[PDB]
Structure formats: C-alpha cells, structure tokens
Design a protein around this nucleic acid. Structure first.
Ligand SMILES: Nc1nc2c(ncn2[C@H]2C[C@H](O)[C@@H](COP(=O)(O)OP(=O)(O)OP(=O)(O)O)O2)c(=O)[nH]1
Ligand code: SF4
Ligand SMILES: [Mg+2]
Ligand SMILES: [Mg+2]
Lengths: 186, 868
DNA sequence: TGTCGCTACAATCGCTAAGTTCACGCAGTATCCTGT
C-alpha cells in the first residue's frame, strides 16, 4: 500500500472508526497509545508495510513540531512490535469489530473504539449529517444503534455510502470493511 | 511494811484505766524458797503540765501587748478562772518551778519559770495548742501515764524496786501469785546493786494445717520447752531446758492411727492428747497459767504464732483468753493492725522474744528462716516436714510421733539459738542502758531506745522534753580510688567511733548549737560546758571500749569471744543510732541541723587527714568517711608497722579525743570501685611469722542476690589473683577453672542449690504494685498461692530462673526449686547463668587484670564473644 | 501502730529520641506488551 492512497481511503474506504482516527491524526499529527496501536494494526490489516507505516508515521509526527529523532527513539520500537518485529515477534492481528466494541473504552482526549458504540446518539447523528447521509438512512442507522446493532449499523453505513441496497456480508472487522469498500469501488 | 520485787514489764491502757500502770515482775517469798511472779498496780499516777508565761499580758483576739508584766500569780489566776472553768477540771496542784529547755519550739527561753500543774488522769487532757493572755505555751499535755511514772521515779530498765505501804486488791486483777496496790507514785523507789533473779523462759513451737475451706490456719501440735531458773546476767545453762510438755490434737474429720495411745504411752513424755482444737487451746492456756513463764520465745512469734493462737482462741471460743497474759480482762484486743501491738497487748506482762527479730538485729545472715539460722548458728541440719506430709501424718503412729518430735526439735533449736546469740542478757543490758521497757527493746528498732535514753538524760537535768510527735542532708566523703592491683603492703587506718568522738570533742548538743528553724550551724564555742548528748554518747563509747579491751584478753573461750564481739557491735550500733536519730523525721528529738553539722565536721576531718597523709609523701588510694588506705611500697612488715605508728601518731596529734588506729595491713589488694575490694589481710603470728586471712568488702561475691555458682567462681578467681603465683600461672589457672565450670554448667553436673538466688521482700506480696513482676515477688505470690505459711515483708525468697518455652524475659521466669523439681516442662536456663551470673561477676572482678577480658571470659565459659 | 542516718553500685523497666529499614515514591534510562 502507498502512503498517499491512505488519505483517499480515510476519505472514502475507512470505516467510521478509522475515519475518525485518521481525522484526529491529521488534525493533531499524534495519537495516544491506544489510538496508535489500533491504527497501526488496522494499517497492517490493509497491507501497509513496516517501512511504509514507519515512514508515514514519522512524517506525520514531525509536523507537530517534534523531532523525528525522538520518534525513531520511541515509536520505532513500538511500530516494530505491532508488526511482530521485536520482543515476542508475533504478527499481531488487527482488531475485529467485536474487540473494538469491547476494547478499551476511550476517555477525554481519546478517539479509539467503535464510534457507533462510543459516540453519543446526538454526536453520531451530527456526524452522519456531516457525511450527507440521507435522513432515512441516518434514522435507520440510529435505530440499529439503539438496539446495540453496531455491526448492523455499520453495515447500514456501508450500504448507504457505497450506493448498494444490501451489504451482503456480516461486518465483523474494520479491515473487513476496508476490503469490502475496495471490492465495491475498485 | 516495805515490798521488794524485781519488775520486768509494764503495761498501761490509756483508754480503759486512766492513770494506772501495772508492773509485772518477780518477788521472793521465803516460804516457797523461790521467786514468784507478782503484779503491782500503781494507781493515781497524776498528769503534769508546764505553762510558759508571757513577758507582758497579750489580748487573745487583738493580739496586742498591754504592757502589764506577767508573774506566776497572774498565770495561776488565769488558769484558775478561764481555763479551769472551760475544760471542767476541778482539783489541781499548782507550784512555780524553774526548768531548762532547748528544743524546737520558737520563742521558748533557755531557762524560765513555769506553773507546774498536776491533776488526776481522769480529768480531761488539755489541747496541745492551748494559749491564753498570760501564757504562750503548755507542755506535757499528751504525756503517757507510763512515761510520766518512769521519768518521775527515775526508773531505768529492769531493776530491783522498793514499794512503800503496799495494799491488797479488793478482787483479783492479775493471773500472778502476789498482787499489790500502790496509792501514789512517790511510794515506789529503786534499789541498786543487786543481781537480777533468774526468770522462767518458755520456748514453744507449733505445727498448723490450713483450712483452705476458709484458709484459716488450725493448730494441731504445740511442743514446748521450759526452764524455771534461766539467768539474766550469767551464761546460759547447759542443757538449756529443765522440763517440757507436748500437746497433740487431731484434725476436724480425720482420726488418730489405731494404737496412737500405746505409742504415746511408750514415748514416756508429758504428752496430752486434745480431742479438739478447743481442748488443745484450753490445755495450753492452763499450762501457761501453771508455769506462768516470764519470757516466751519463738520463731515468727510476733507475726505468725501468737496471731494464729489468738485467732483460733477466738474461733473456738475458749473462755479465759487473758490468761495468755498476766492481767485479767474480758474483751480480746482487735486483731489486725501493723506491728505486733495486738500480740504484745494480748500477752501483756510477758516478754515475747522473736528469735527472728533478734537474729536480724544481732547478726547478718543470707536468710532468716529457721533452717538457715540453725545451720549458721548451731551448725546443724534441720529436717522440714512439708504441709502435705503434716496432713498425711494422721495415718500411722510412726509418722505422728515423728511430726511431734520434729516440733520438739524445732523448739529445742529455737531455745539453743536464743542461748547462743545471748539474746536475753543483751536485751537486759541494752534496756538498762536505754531505760525503756524490755518488751519494746526485744520488739526491735533503735528509735525508742535512743529516745528514752535522751528522755532520761534530760529529765534528770531539769529539762522539759518535747511532747511525743502525735537525703535531707549531706553525708560522708568517699575518696576517688586508684583502681588496680597492688602486690605490696597496704596500710589501712580507721578512726575509732568517729561520729561519737566528733560529738564528744566538739561539744555538739541541743543546748550548745544555736540552730535556726539548709545551712550548717556554726560550731559551738569552746567555752561552753559539756552538753547532755556528749555525756551520754561518751558513756556508750566508754562501755564499748571496755568491752573491746576485755576482748583483748588472751586465751578466751572462742564462743564467749564471739558473744563479746556481738555485744561490742551492738554498742557501736547503739551509738551510731544515737547519732542517726537526730536526723529521723519522725523522732521526738529531730535535730537535722545537728546531724548535718556532725557529717560536715566528719568531712572536714577526712579532708584534713588526707591532706596530712599526702603531705607526708605517702600515697593515698582509698577512704570511706573515716578511713584511709596507704600504699607503703614496702616488702618488710616491721617497717610497715613503724610507718603506721609514725603516721598514726602524727594524725592523732591534732585532736583531743579522736584517735586513729591501724585497722589492718593488706599484703595484696584488688581495688575495683568505691566500697568494693578484696585483700589478703595480714595477722601477725609472732617472731616475724604472720598468717594471711582473706577479706572481701562489697564485692558481688558477698551479696545474697547472686547464684552460689557465681559466688564460688568469684571466690576461686579472687584466690588465684591474690596469690603469689606467677601471673602466667594465675591466668592459666583462671582459664582452666572457668572452662571446667562452663563444662559443669553445660552438663548439668552442678548441684541444684547452687542455682538459687536470694532476694528479700519490702512489703507484703499483694501490696507490691503491678510494676511488671519483680522476680522474687513473682515466686512470693506462688508461695502464697500454694497451701503453706504465707511470706510477709522482710522475707528472703530463693528463686531459680529456668527455661519454660515462654520466650519471655528472664525477670519473668523466676521459679522456686520445688517448682522445677515438680514440673516436667521446666529446665534450668544454663545459658542465662553462664552469661548473666557467671560472666558479669568475674568480668567486673577481673577488669584491672591483664590477660582477661569479656571475650576471653565468654570463650572460656563456652559462650559467644559476639554479645560481649 | 512504729518505722537510726547517708553514699555507691548493679540490674531492670519505662519512655523517648536517634537511627535504620525500607518501602513509598519519584527524575533518568532500558526492554518487552496487546488478537486472531
Ligand atoms: N547512723 C549510722 N551511722 C553509721 C552507721 N554505720 C556507720 N555509720 C557512720 C558513723 C560511724 O562513726 C562512721 C564510721 O564508720 P565505722 O564502721 O568505722 O564505725 P566507727 O568508726 O564509729 O567505729 P569502729 O571503727 O568500728 O571502731 O560511719 C549506721 O549504721 N548508722
Ligand atoms: S462496526 Fe466495526 S468497522 Fe464499523 S465503526 Fe464499529 S468497529 Fe469500525
Ligand atoms: Mg505513551
Ligand atoms: Mg571507724
């Protein structure tokens, strides 16, 4: 995968979770540990290489008026690890939607987790309105959310954004969302 | 018409019979050709006061000074009008009498005239703080009838008395054989220069079993020995006893063995078997009445024996209780109360001798229980029957007779101890010297003796003594010792009767020192005449000097020599107590300024003597308030004696009475600290031949609070150190002996008694606060917990610190020897002894010794040097 | 109810301060972590 197309994915292909993560990163050019771990694992899932992810993260973190030397000192080892390059050297797998729902709950200043689960209904409605989603689609997504159908709510988002009547797949992974989006688009 | 008798004891009841004193003694009746006890009731012993007039009349409330001179006529007028009416006193005799006074009541002139007034003791007693316009003080208000009588008739200790115009009592009042009533104190006189008559002495020992149902102590046997002609001025007779009687009873429920009667009959003794304790007490009282002994002797008689007797008399309701004394009464005195006052009053007219108190006063022993005294004085071994065996004795004739014979042997030992110490002659002598009653003297204590001595002295000199009272000052100087070991000759100089000699020389007296009611008053002027106290103390010192010179006679019976030594020590202590009672807060003659002056003069004398000896180019190494130790640095004894005589003459040259004599010559000395040294005292044998006798002062080896193992180890170590052996051999022998003792302790081969440690008691075991638990006190309580005679104050207790698995401090593991021998979970703490009884003493002893240190002692003891 | 005096040493208990442990922590640095 190429660094430039990551922006395109964040605009279109990324699920709302990774979409928010990318928006936060490009707004702040820094993610907390939880967000860094989640986003790195997702970028591993899409296919970004260790070198590509290291380069992209280095470049992004440098823009926050920080040394890239500090990045190489600290985040280099972590980026190595999350790709199973050091320590136990295990190819750590990207999180599934169930984990994201049941993963660490974000707090103030955090942006990880499933937005459908960790975003208040008003915030989710506002975000969906920002994305130009039809009012009926937004209402259906909200109804799915209220019954705790965050997987089904995300499938509704995928159906609405890709102009497809039925998702045709049981969304259980953000990278699975990425693969389905790429299949529909490309 | 005269009536001559030898009085021994006097009893007065301040409340029951006012102004009456009973004198009990012996009177010779020709018909019986022997002495018989007689009682004389001196009635109408009036009470006398003394009034001190004012210089000028003073308004009582305004506290004014009108200015009218106050003469004796005015004083009599005031006492006749105001006071006599106020206090309801009808008849009195008034006279003017000039008396002297020097004591602690401000604004009382040395000499003045008073209106001596006497009236019947039945009339009310004036208040001690009485005052009026015409008089500023009233004396003698609370004077006891006995004291008034004794001081009025100048009666000074037991002695022959002459009574004029005796009369007979309407009805019997005493249990004696002859009675006589004297109508006035003037009718009693004293006759001198006649030997005291022999008296009857009854020694009684009893065996009791406690009733744990009530914890009441019931008597089950009384072995009594009597001698009817015991002398009071000669040596004790041999054998001490003339005849004897034994009385034996049974318990409440138990019964006699089968053939007790046959065994008792075969015993051939004057045994009377009492069915019940009631019958036993009745028989005992009848026996006491028949013999009517004058001096009843016993062990713990004042604390245990008499109290038990009276308690059981009350419990069984034995009719005639007062027969235990010599007067007739009806209501027994209330028991309880401190001291033996209940006992003494119950036994009024009989001199009670407690060989425990007498032994405590006369000699010093590690323990005062009867067995230890018997082993020390009589050098005999006593078999002790445990109380369980006493209960079990009512099961066979053999054991019952063994118990009774043990009681008899205890009585015999008590009498033997009394005779050996020479308690009765010494009591008579000291009572005659002091002038008090003999029973009080035998009760112990120094305060009453000195108080009565000074009472007699001042009264005979026209003085008004003060009414009985209804580290406050510096002491002696101890020179800093030169601690070390001295192998050459040491010369010890000691002052002779230092404080008495100071009082004599400097004329210190109540009438010479102008005191002020903490500054030392000035020394009295040399112009004054000798005072009362110098005269009395001079008499005591002269008596002691006479006894000591008598001791110088060669070829004296060694036992008689020891008796003379005891008498000399008693006189020395009497003089020293005469000094000390000046500084006794509760004494009648509290003159703390005088005691402070005496001690200050002693310190000045010691400092001057040290300066003189040092100025002679002689080394000074020690001194304790009257003595000096000099290092002669010589090896020839003749030169040592020459130098001693030289220095003694030079020191004596500066004093009028004080004399310094050579106390001893030490061949070798080990000066450890103040009041702690051991020496090889040298006693010349003749022709240049001398014998060396060991002498220990103040060390731990001479203290009862250390295990006898430690005492033995220290004695051996000192013996090795003080010897002339080469130093290397001395150190080697010390190491070898210490290793041997360590092995013996580790292997348990030491006899168990060697682990005993003795500590006395200050109060009753209960009265001790919960200040953790003092070791002895702990064991003390256990003794009372068990079924045996309780342990009261001033009782030595031997405890052994033993392992119990408790992982607690040693202080809290004190155990009796019987406890260890009984319990199977208690074992002697070998490490404790090796580390805290053997090590500390030897380590302190060997401090100035080269080659020995704490680590080496621990190693040779087998201990770990780490902690040391 | 009476109960001589003071000086010196040793041992023990109580209370408290001085010191030690030593676990709180931190500032600095380092490695190795997470899921399917
Ligand atoms: N009050 C009182 N004073 C004592 C006692 N023991 C010693 N002193 C005082 C008074 C003695 O005169 C002084 C000197 O002690 P000493 O034992 O050498 O007796 P002292 O010199 O009087 O006679 P001595 O050397 O034995 O012939 O210490 C005592 O038990 N009570
Ligand atoms: S359902 Fe899955 S893909 Fe969709 S927002 Fe939640 S975690 Fe992301
Ligand atoms: Mg971090
Ligand atoms: Mg002396």
């Amino acid at each position: 995968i190429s660094l430039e197309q990551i922006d395109g994915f964040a605009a279109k292909s990324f699920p709302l979770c990774m979409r928010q993560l990318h928006k936060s990163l490009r707004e702040n050019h820094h993610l907390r540990h939880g967000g860094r771990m989640q986003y790195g694992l997702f970028l591993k899932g899409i296919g970004l290489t260790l070198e590509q992810a290291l380069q992209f993260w280095r470049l992004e973190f440098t823009k926050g008026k920080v040394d890239s030397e500090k990045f190489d000192k600290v985040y280099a080892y972590s980026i190595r690890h999350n790709y199973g390059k050091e320590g136990k050297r295990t190819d750590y797998t990207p999180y599934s939607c169930m984990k994201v729902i049941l993963s660490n709950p974000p707090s103030q200043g955090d942006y990880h987790g499933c937005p459908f689960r960790h975003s208040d209904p008003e915030l989710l409605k506002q975000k969906l309105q920002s994305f130009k989603v039809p009012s009926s689609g937004i209402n259906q997504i909200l109804e799915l959310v209220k019954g705790m159908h965050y997987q089904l709510a995300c499938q509704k988002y995928f159906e609405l954004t890709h102009s497809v009547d039925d998702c045709g797949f049981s969304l259980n992974h953000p990278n699975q969302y990425f693969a389905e989006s790429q299949k529909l688009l490309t | 018409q005269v009536f001559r008798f030898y009085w021994l004891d006097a009893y007065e009841d301040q409340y029951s019979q006012p102004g009456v004193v009973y004198l009990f003694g012996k009177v010779w009746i020709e018909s019986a050709d022997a002495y018989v006890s007689c009682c004389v009731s001196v009635k109408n012993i009036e009470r006398t006061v003394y009034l001190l007039p004012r210089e000028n009349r003073v308004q009582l409330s305004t506290g004014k000074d009108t200015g009218a001179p106050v003469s004796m006529m005015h004083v009599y007028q005031e006492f006749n009008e105001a006071v006599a009416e106020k206090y309801k006193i009808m008849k009195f005799k008034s006279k003017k009498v000039d008396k002297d006074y020097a004591f602690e009541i401000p604004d009382v002139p040395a000499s003045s005239e008073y209106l001596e007034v006497r009236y019947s003791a039945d009339s009310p007693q004036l208040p001690q703080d009485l005052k009026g316009e015409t008089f500023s003080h009233v004396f003698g208000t609370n004077t006891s009838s006995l004291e008034l009588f004794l001081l009025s008739r100048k009666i000074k200790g037991p002695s022959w008395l002459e009574i004029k115009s005796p009369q007979l009592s309407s009805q019997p009042m005493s249990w004696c054989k002859v009675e006589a009533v004297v109508t006035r104190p003037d009718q009693v006189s004293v006759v001198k220069d006649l030997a005291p008559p022999p008296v009857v002495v009854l020694s009684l020992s009893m065996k009791t079993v406690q009733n744990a149902k009530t914890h009441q102590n019931e008597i089950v046997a009384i072995a009594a020995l009597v001698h009817h002609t015991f002398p009071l001025d000669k040596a004790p007779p041999q054998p001490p006893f003339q005849t004897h009687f034994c009385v034996l009873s049974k318990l409440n429920d138990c019964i006699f063995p089968y053939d007790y009667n046959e065994a008792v009959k075969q015993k051939n003794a004057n045994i009377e078997i009492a069915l019940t304790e009631r019958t036993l007490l009745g028989f005992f009282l009848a026996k006491i009445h028949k013999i009517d002994p004058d001096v009843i002797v016993g062990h713990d008689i004042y604390g245990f024996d008499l109290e038990v007797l009276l308690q059981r008399i009350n419990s069984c309701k034995v009719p005639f209780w007062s027969k235990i004394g010599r007067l007739r009464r009806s209501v027994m005195p209330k028991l309880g109360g401190r001291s033996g006052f209940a006992e003494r009053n119950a036994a009024c007219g009989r001199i009670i001798c407690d060989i425990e108190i007498s032994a405590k006063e006369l000699i010093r022993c590690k323990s005062y229980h009867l067995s230890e005294l018997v082993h020390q004085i009589l050098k005999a071994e006593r078999v002790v029957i445990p109380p369980e065996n006493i209960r079990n004795a009512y099961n066979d004739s053999v054991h019952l007779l063994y118990m009774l014979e043990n009681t008899w042997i205890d009585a015999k030992f008590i009498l033997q101890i009394m005779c050996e110490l020479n308690v009765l002659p010494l009591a008579l002598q000291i009572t005659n010297i002091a002038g008090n009653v003999m029973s009080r003297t035998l009760m112990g204590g120094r305060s009453e003796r000195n108080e009565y001595l000074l009472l007699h002295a001042f009264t005979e000199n026209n003085f008004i003594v003060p009414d009985k009272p209804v580290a406050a000052y510096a002491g002696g100087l101890v020179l800093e010792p030169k601690v070390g070991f001295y192998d050459k000759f040491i010369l010890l100089l000691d002052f002779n009767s230092l404080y008495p000699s100071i009082i004599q020389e400097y004329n210190i007296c109540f009438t010479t020192v102008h005191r002020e009611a903490d500054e030392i008053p000035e020394l009295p002027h040399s112009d004054l005449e000798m005072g009362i106290l110098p005269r009395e103390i001079r008499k005591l010192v002269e008596r002691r000097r006479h006894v000591k010179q008598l001791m110088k006679q060669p070829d004296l019976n060694p036992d008689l020599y020891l008796q003379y030594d005891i008498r000399q020590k008693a006189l020395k202590l009497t003089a020293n107590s005469m000094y000390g009672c000046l500084g006794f807060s509760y004494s009648r003659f509290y003159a703390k300024p005088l005691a402070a002056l005496v001690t200050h003069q002693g310190r000045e004398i010691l400092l001057h003597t040290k300066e003189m000896v040092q100025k002679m180019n002689l080394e000074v190494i020690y001194g304790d308030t009257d003595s000096i130790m000099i290092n002669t640095n010589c090896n020839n004894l003749e030169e040592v004696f020459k130098l001693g005589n030289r220095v003694k003459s030079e020191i004596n040259k500066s004093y009028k009475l004080l004399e310094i004599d050579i106390d001893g010559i030490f061949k070798s000395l080990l000066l450890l600290k103040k009041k702690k040294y051991a020496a090889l005292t040298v006693e010349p044998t003749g022709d240049g031949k001398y014998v060396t006798k060991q002498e220990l002062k103040g060390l731990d080896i001479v203290r009862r609070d250390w295990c006898e193992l430690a005492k033995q180890a220290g004695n051996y170590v000192i013996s090795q150190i003080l010897s002339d052996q080469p130093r290397d051999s001395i150190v080697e022998n010390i190491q070898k002996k210490l290793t041997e003792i360590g092995e013996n302790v580790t292997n348990g081969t030491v006899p168990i008694t060697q682990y005993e440690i003795n500590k006395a008691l200050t109060k009753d075991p209960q009265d001790y606060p919960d200040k953790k638990s003092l070791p002895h006190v702990h064991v003390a309580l256990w003794i009372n917990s068990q079924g045996g005679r309780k342990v009261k104050a001033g009782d030595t207790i031997s405890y052994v610190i033993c392992q119990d698995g408790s992982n607690l401090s040693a202080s809290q593991r004190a155990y009796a020897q019987e406890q260890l021998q009984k319990q199977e979970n208690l074992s002697i703490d070998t490490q404790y002894y090796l580390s805290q009884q053997v090590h500390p003493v030897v380590a302190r002893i060997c401090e100035p010794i080269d080659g020995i240190d704490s680590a080496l002692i621990a190693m040779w003891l087998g201990l770990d040097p780490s902690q040391f």
